[PDB]
Subunit: 116 residues, 6 copies
């Protein structure tokens, strides 16, 4: 996932960061202190950006032409996933975090099929 290539990939890298995005969104409901709200905003932005990186790397570095041929929806799915993560950056609603997780789960499903 480091572009050597090293051969090691797992959608879990993206997933755990998206899980933290949604967890932060949920915690925002639990404490109205402005400093806490701001820290949650700062950290959500950071973790969402890492998730985008992980998703992009799966698409550019792991997935190859036979995959794109077998899964003609994959390009669009990855774009949509990244856009969902942008939407979670901009929102305090955990529904936006969850949508991104749902998209990652669709990438994950394809990833492991290609590992069999």
């Amino acid at each position: 996932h480091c572009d050597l290539p090293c051969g090691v990939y797992d959608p879990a890298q993206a997933r755990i960061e998206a899980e933290s995005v949604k967890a932060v969104q949920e915690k925002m409901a639990g404490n109205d202190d402005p400093h806490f709200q701001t820290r949650a905003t700062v950290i959500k932005e950071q973790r969402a950006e890492l998730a985008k990186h992980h998703v992009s790397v799966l698409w550019s570095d792991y997935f190859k032409p036979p995959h794109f041929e077998k899964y003609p929806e994959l390009h669009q799915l990855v774009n949509d996933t990244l856009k969902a993560m942008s939407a979670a950056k901009g929102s305090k609603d955990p529904a936006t975090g969850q949508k991104a997780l749902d998209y990652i789960a669709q990438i994950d499903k394809i990833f492991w099929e290609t590992k069999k």
Copy 2:
């Protein structure tokens, strides 16, 4: 380009980094000092990674569904551009840097079309 959105994008960010990758490749042919070679390798890797970020951000953040409809080749073009940049990371041959620049120029052409209509 920063995902606010700020509304500010330009393929020149990707291009300048890809230009530095090819320049570094060229310079590796001009000085066989091992410490230089190593520094060149370190820096090429970093600038190529930055170019990959810039290209991915144009694809995810700038381009929108109407663009993917109008330019059905664009998803594959971006994927190929990123793969070209990984190949450049891997190589000292400036032809690899040039191939990445060639792909970015295809993206740049589409980008400025979308700025007009």
Copy 3:
């Protein structure tokens, strides 16, 4: 610009980040939602910091003694540019982003003469 040296320099790196800083200041005028305001503040701070790096690199790595002799005001101009970007970090007023852009344009003019 990467200190190899690679021989590749362009004030456009600094300018585009400074353009984003001003753009973000403008955005802040059109959406008073605090979460958006907070995100804008985070991102403005990041883009301005990158702009400062690009301006510093031009000054330390690209420009050379003959340039400083020919343009005796360039050192102070670069320092002033960096201080304008700090002022943009601290402000929501797009005029501060514009002042930083105006300083970068003066560095850009000199840069291209040195070519």
Copy 4:
């Protein structure tokens, strides 16, 4: 894992980075090209440093006084794990990457026991 706290942690973050470190070490045995050796070294250093970060965060942020009471070996285990990752940075031998994986696995066992409850 981000210090909010967000409450999300998994040793898998440290483990996947350590897996990439060992994989890089193995690949270094299969291609003696200097440019490749240099890239591998660069990237190993980066992924090992990320692994150290992940391990340090489990120790400082996830693990708490009752865990240090129940597992009195845990402080020294985490210190030993970080030193194993420094040793893997310094080595091309995949046994050093494996040793760090083996330490992480001890951390992971404790982690999941503390999650049972």
Copy 5:
């Protein structure tokens, strides 16, 4: 401190970042402008994270088994120091930045005993 090893370490790296965290907290008492409060929050988070890195590196990279033998309290001291810096991240109260500085001073004292 770069893991070469280079042999160069100084708790001053952690200390100056912790001092900037406390200074930020103090500044937050002097200007309730939201924009300023937010920038202060951003920056405090970043400098505290750097302080944590510095402390962790002293522990993992500088200190060695003879030191952990002579100072059996050192592992918990470092853990306590990093928890104190997490607490400073979460707070505007300069008492929290000061507690982190107090813990760093205990690490500094041990550090220089081990150097002589």
Copy 6:
């Protein structure tokens, strides 16, 4: 040092990174193993870059107009320091790291005079 402003500055941040650069250069002379040499080059590049950041921040953020009038050589001194750091990046010779330290030492002397010392 963080541009809040926080009011906290010390040229020691730059000094300790330049010390590590020089130390890395010394160690390079004592171990010609290719992997070691590559790691040393990677790290030297990183610490030198950090030193450049610290010096630049002193110049742009700590020092102010009255200081530039009192110390008319200060602008050129900071520029020369940054150039010396670039030269240390490019070199294995610890004399290059020492030259950067001597320039930092001149900035440090001015810094503490301005703190009123």
